[PDB]
Amino acid sequence: VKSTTKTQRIASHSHVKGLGLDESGLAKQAASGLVGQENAREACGVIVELIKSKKMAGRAVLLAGPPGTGKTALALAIAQELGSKVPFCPMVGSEVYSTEIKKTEVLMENFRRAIGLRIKETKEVYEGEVTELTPCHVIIGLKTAKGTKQLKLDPSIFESLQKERVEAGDVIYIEANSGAVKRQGRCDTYATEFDLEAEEYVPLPKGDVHKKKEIIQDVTLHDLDVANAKLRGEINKVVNKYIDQGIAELVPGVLFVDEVHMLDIECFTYLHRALESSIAPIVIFASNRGNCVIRGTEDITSPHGIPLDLLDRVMIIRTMLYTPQEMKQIIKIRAQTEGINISEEALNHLGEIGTKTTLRYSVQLLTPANLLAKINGKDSIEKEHVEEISELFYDAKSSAKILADQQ
Amino acid sequence: VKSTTKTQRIASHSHVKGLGLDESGLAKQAASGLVGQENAREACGVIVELIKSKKMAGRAVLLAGPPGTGKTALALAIAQELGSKVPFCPMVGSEVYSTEIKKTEVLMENFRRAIGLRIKETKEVYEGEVTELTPCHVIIGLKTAKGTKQLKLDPSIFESLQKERVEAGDVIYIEANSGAVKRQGRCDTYATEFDLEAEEYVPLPKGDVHKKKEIIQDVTLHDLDVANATDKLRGEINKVVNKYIDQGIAELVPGVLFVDEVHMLDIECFTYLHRALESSIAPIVIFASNRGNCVIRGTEDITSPHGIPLDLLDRVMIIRTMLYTPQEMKQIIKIRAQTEGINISEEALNHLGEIGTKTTLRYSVQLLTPANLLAKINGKDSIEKEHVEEISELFYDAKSSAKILADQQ
Amino acid sequence: IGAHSHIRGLGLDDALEPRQASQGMVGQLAARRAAGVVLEMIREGKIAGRAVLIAGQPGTGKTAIAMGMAQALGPDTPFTAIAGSEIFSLEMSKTEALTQAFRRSIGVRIKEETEIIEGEVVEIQIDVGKLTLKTTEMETIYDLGTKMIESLTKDKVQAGDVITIDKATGKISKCPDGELQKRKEVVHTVSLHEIDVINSRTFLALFSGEIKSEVREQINAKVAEWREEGKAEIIPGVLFIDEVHMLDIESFSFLNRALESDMAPVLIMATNRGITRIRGTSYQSPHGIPIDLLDRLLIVSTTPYSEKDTKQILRIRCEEEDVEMSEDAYTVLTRIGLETSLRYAIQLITAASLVCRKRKGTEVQVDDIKRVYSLFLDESRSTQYMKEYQD
Amino acid sequence: IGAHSHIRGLGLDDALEPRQASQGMVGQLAARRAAGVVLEMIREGKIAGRAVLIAGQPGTGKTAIAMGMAQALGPDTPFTAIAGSEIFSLEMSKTEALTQAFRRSIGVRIKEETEIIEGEVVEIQIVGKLTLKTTEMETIYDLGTKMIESLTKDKVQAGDVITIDKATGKISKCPDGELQKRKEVVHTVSLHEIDVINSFLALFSEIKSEVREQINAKVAEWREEGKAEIIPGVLFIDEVHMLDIESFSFLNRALESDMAPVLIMATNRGITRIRGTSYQSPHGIPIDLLDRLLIVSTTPYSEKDTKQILRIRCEEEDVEMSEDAYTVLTRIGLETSLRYAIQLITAASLVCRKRKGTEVQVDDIKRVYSLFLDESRSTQYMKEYQ
């Protein structure tokens, strides 16, 4: 089943690989693609420990902080810390009440996308160290504890291997019943200081090349629902049967709800009732307002729009602001993740740009700046390129001021 | 949609493939699983011609003859001669007025099963001669004019290939959009005296393996009715069929509705059948009777030939059925044995032939199974005269059974 | 009530070689072997769309042959014996009556889940407490009760006392020697009708009906669910319709419908009429059956009874009635069973027994037989003399 | 689940004299006296056609007093605490939400015979046996490994009341009588429980009316026969001001029935416009309902009672605190809400375990205070940003 995930939404936080805090509890300045926000980082660590202790009895987390302070980044870091394949479903409340569909159905699907299934199934795969890659019926030698095995593959399987960038001395498993090659990594024989055991330089497979590997498929309920197209309930029953059999271990994810202040009180009640259940995922809010009025009441004003009932069961985690240094560091990290070479003076100008408007604006400015630099035949971005890009594209605040100023 | 047909009812007449008459018009002694019945046989070929001429205007056929003389078989042959897939829906008149349902509805489904729909649709199928059958994602080499194609199949399709008994060197089509393997036959490269062109040794496919073939689906109107399931939906299903015809992919093909035991049909039922056959789209309704001038069912006073009211008889093309002598009786029973697979001695067949004369050809045919099963227990592959005599002494027939009971009385 | 309570299979075996006595069934060897042929046909499954009709005079064993066939097919194969006139009831229509008959002939061997906690009782532990239970695996003293331990104490302690779910205690041998808390596939042939009765809401219902169609729909869906799961294995039973000629033409068409299903049970019919009026029509047909059904009919003729066979059958029945009688009394009964119906002879047996007790005897003599013969008459005599009064 | 599971009664002694600290309640003497008056009014049955509304600022035990009253009415009297905003839900209309809330409070005490495997443990026999003695007899009643582990979990060897093939309970070592105490346990099943029974990711992926009618008929039949016992409970609706005029009318209608449970509402606004209509009224309640309302006001909390409450809560959460930590938590709970103070405790426990300590210090309390913001601080800090 095709994975149904908004790759674009989380693509901006791809550098985040975890919460980056030590065993003691305090957080280092920079680790796992996370810079600053030490207090919120420790709070998130505490929440992670609570979740793993199953002490989140009918509770949620509210991340309060100004725009562009990594609320979504912190939620993604929490999701990563609970597990690399733990589901993460970000969503802004402004799109619950779409013109069509139904608020209940939108929240329903959002909740579904946050509940995963660890389907571990034993399939005989071709887990072996590629010794040679002869493409003729593609008899590729897979040396393992048993030895090299000239297992005849198919041109489609060879194309799949090429898509996985599998080369010589690459310990890969080729699930035989489905003919899918998945690059596990290289061999431990070439392990160096950075290349280590049981990673992209995975050690030599111990056992026969054709081994029944307990492969775990990470898939959430919603993907199954879209695959089977009431119908929704029927998918639930099959999932329950799967778990009962003893191969589907449920793993609750994280549901990140941004712009919570603009959610109906009915939606708040629905979320409360959903989080009441034990199987429910952790519901993490995020807001930028103060004591803004509740949406569907018009007279009761409560912190961050949340009604007092839910908000009595909420752990507020405050997010701080970034000083020029942190902004520059984060911009450089994002540029590195994008493959962008940028000068330090350009990074400084980008940091002061972000300080005025937002981190979002500074990060977005990178791509057009790199394209402009490429057009002029330069491999790097200089301060002049950033100046020109800032003079070309504006930000909401400044453009609104320009429009009002003339008025 | 699953085909809804009484395979058991027509199972006894699977040896028949058609009328088996020559171009001149005369009927040969034995052909296409029909022995004897020359006068009747040559007649049926005629009605098939009037059917093909569209001169069967408001007319039907009444098949008169004794029990067990191929009244059903001749009706089956008429359907076969008009087309291999032409629908044939037999029925006994005694099953019209059942405790439940309604006589109108009962006669309803009987008519529907007698109408076919030739829905030809161009679907890209995998028509090619099997070069190799490597089942690993079942990459089967299918060599055609373009060449051999190692098409990646699925194990489910591979099981379908095994269900069709597909081996090396067989020109077969595998619907790509449906994942179903159909055995068209072998390749003409191995054609011998019996294997011929465009048959179970079909020639080498000309064109790309993935060729869009206008496949014909033979489905009757009732099949759709049952698939889409109260009542009154019947109208909508008729609507859809009409729409399909209008588009130009479903060529309507009227079939044959066989009505046995017509002498025991209510007069009201007769009127309905008369009105139905008035319509041009109506299929050919072929009656069958064994009585003489039995009084009409719903009148109790007026006696008319074979129960049919004089109105209907005035428009009927009655085909007479002759009796079978020992020789034909022996021949026919032997053909039946071959179709199911019994080795039987000639003397055993001769005894079986005399049995048929006394009771029926039905009774002799039914005796084959228990006799061959009895021989199997004794470890014998072929049935001998002793087995037939013993089986006749175990199971009885209606006439003899009634005579025994009355005699004791 | 308790007739044919000794026909345990056809008792021929030996590659279709009927023995004179076998297990209760004595005589009618001809029809017995024919029944054996049908039995193998059911096993091989080449009887679909076919039926069996047993012709013969009354009291020749046609019902007994049907009972033996069901027993021979299996120890728990459902058997339904109804009469042709049983369908003409004011409550139910012919459809409902025949539908119910087919249902109860359709048996389902639901392999009910029973967590049998058995084990040889090492010590009868009182009581809500536990009970020392031991098997070959381990000795796991298990949970018990008072009303249950009362049953255990009321039973043979200690004699194993196989406990199933804390209901039964088999005091056979010390045999609960497997796994202490084990599992069992309890064979349970619940007729399709039996499932219907459970769902139906409704002890005087017989005095002060018709199963709703929706109830039929639900259990049919349920039966498919268990069948796909693997718990229920539908067992095609035997449906016997005595006095088949009583059924009319409309019912006969319904039988055709029900015999063309994968759940259709083997239909066995019996009639003693030759060419008679087909009920509901103005024609004459053998056995009063429409030709459509008669064509595909396995018809077996039950021969009338011989002298010694009648005497042997009586011997079997008296053993069931716990009646000791003299040989002369035996012969007179056999003569009665010859001039009159065999059923009349059986009726005399029980009545004569109370005659013997009236004079405080143990063995019934010839004197008692004549005393009851004059007391209660046979249908022929009653009708014979009684028409004599009329003229 | 959980929350304030430490009060088993109002604790007002007798003759409406609250004995300060008792079964949880450690303050609000006026409110406790009023709640006791209301309870014994309910007992004598002159509260029909009335309701109780408890006013007071947040964090003054408004729900605690209602829970205490529910406990004091009976050891198994149903208690249903919902919120005013709880009814405007996406699945159910306010009609259905309030109907479910009411039926949640109508409890049915139905007897149910059960063979509790009980006996005064004379010797703790280890899967295996366990000697048990009763007035009926004495024998070594067999138990499983987990059953004996739970027996050791309870005080050994007082008791134990081991329900049939189930857990045990500490009494004394003395439950006696029959080794088969075939005691018909009077299970208190609320109407809604039966309704749901007749009707595991269902919440992630409402009952028609026929099920409701069948439930009512069956429950009435059982109660009439003498098997069940309909015992109206207490229904608590926090944030009553959130309710609108239409739901208030339905509440008025439902209070008219004979099965209606004691209705308790809590509000902290005063002189607030009714959610429906455009007319200002005290606590946002239409006067038709305010006329027949018994009003109880919960006074704000003082330092010593707050510290006692915190002591009880830490006793519930298995946390040992330093006295300085207790004083700082008390001052926090006075400057902020009690709820935030309670929240602080669990986080401080994990902070303490991070440094592998046994008792939480003031340092952990301050670290967690800096970690998680509370209601007032977060707003202040947010608006200043804007």
Ligand SMILES: Nc1ncnc2c1ncn2[C@@H]1O[C@H](COP(=O)(O)OP(=O)(O)O)[C@@H](O)[C@H]1O
């Ligand atoms: N603590 C952090 N560590 C590393 N990168 C961060 C951090 N916070 C924010 N970022 C980066 O800045 C970005 C913009 O944050 P944003 O999406 O505005 O957060 P939110 O809107 O949820 O407050 C992200 O693209 C992220 O890569």
Ligand SMILES: Nc1ncnc2c1ncn2[C@@H]1O[C@H](COP(=O)(O)OP(=O)(O)O)[C@@H](O)[C@H]1O
């Ligand atoms: N002309 C024929 N050629 C070969 N076989 C025939 C012919 N006519 C009848 N039979 C066989 O004899 C059979 C019995 O005939 P039956 O079904 O009684 O015909 P009818 O419809 O006339 O009663 C069929 O089973 C059929 O196989």
Ligand SMILES: Nc1ncnc2c1ncn2[C@@H]1O[C@H](COP(=O)(O)OP(=O)(O)O)[C@@H](O)[C@H]1O
């Ligand atoms: N083979 C047999 N062995 C023993 N007893 C038999 C046998 N056949 C028939 N009987 C006896 O004859 C009776 C058979 O009933 P029967 O009159 O054949 O039923 P139906 O009403 O169909 O005629 C039973 O009471 C049975 O005791």
Ligand SMILES: Nc1ncnc2c1ncn2[C@@H]1O[C@H](COP(=O)(O)OP(=O)(O)O)[C@@H](O)[C@H]1O
């Ligand atoms: N009388 C009391 N005795 C002990 N604890 C109490 C008492 N009243 C309130 N509490 C506890 O104090 C905390 C705050 O009070 P709470 O009942 O939530 O306030 P309110 O209902 O007025 O908003 C809760 O944990 C509650 O259990």
